[PDB]
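Predicting holo structure, protoporphyrin IX containing FE bound.
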Amino acid sequence: PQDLSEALKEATKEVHTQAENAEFMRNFQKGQVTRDGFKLVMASLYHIYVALEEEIERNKESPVFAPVYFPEELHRKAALEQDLAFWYGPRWQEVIPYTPAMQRYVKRLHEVGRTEPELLVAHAYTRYLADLSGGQVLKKIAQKALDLPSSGEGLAFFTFPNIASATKFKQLYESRMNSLEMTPAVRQRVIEEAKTAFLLNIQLFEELQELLTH
Ligand code: HEM
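Done. Tokens:
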């Protein structure tokens, strides 16, 4: 539709299905997930969020992003640090992996926040609404499949403490996105960058699948 939030959903319908068919993702979707597979996903999320959040901070005051700037409600770096310390130990920062697919995703994030900030919204939208929408089912799948100790840590990433209602926050977020002022050219590029975002994820899964089954 005419609303960007609406245009984005319809346009990425295909890549979303593709992301779904991602072996690593479909397996996870079916419960087929191992500690090592999970650990790789968390390290992956950590590098992605460090880059994303780093770029969001860089453009927080820009009209092309300010409306969707939700630091308290959305930041994930801290939660992931808390999770990685659990999954990788006190020296997690020295052992977590940083694979080519992770780097490639990080690279496009920085390229966007630095040279194409008007498109950062596409990446924030893809990531945040992805993690906010399916986060619970995946977390749920995780604790049941991972059978982790009652340590009380490792899954903080999946809980957005500063968000009482995901559905309501989503409405607010979509409204903020639609409040953004952009020309048809930029809107087309943002739509296209959303797809690029899914593709980067899809290639990430593919890689983590090649790594896990080796
Ligand atoms: C097998 C895996 C997946 C399943 C079954 C799944 C399922 C869904 C479902 C049913 C929705 C709710 C639709 C809505 O109310 O808007 C949703 C929304 C969404 N998903 Fe996924 N998803 C999966 C993987 C992913 C991945 C890998 C990403 C991207 C990294 C992603 C990004 C999104 C986004 C951005 C939305 C927001 C849609 C909107 O604009 O309203 N999903 N997903």
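Residues 1-214 form a domain with the Heme Oxygenase; Chain A fold (CATH 1.20.910.10).
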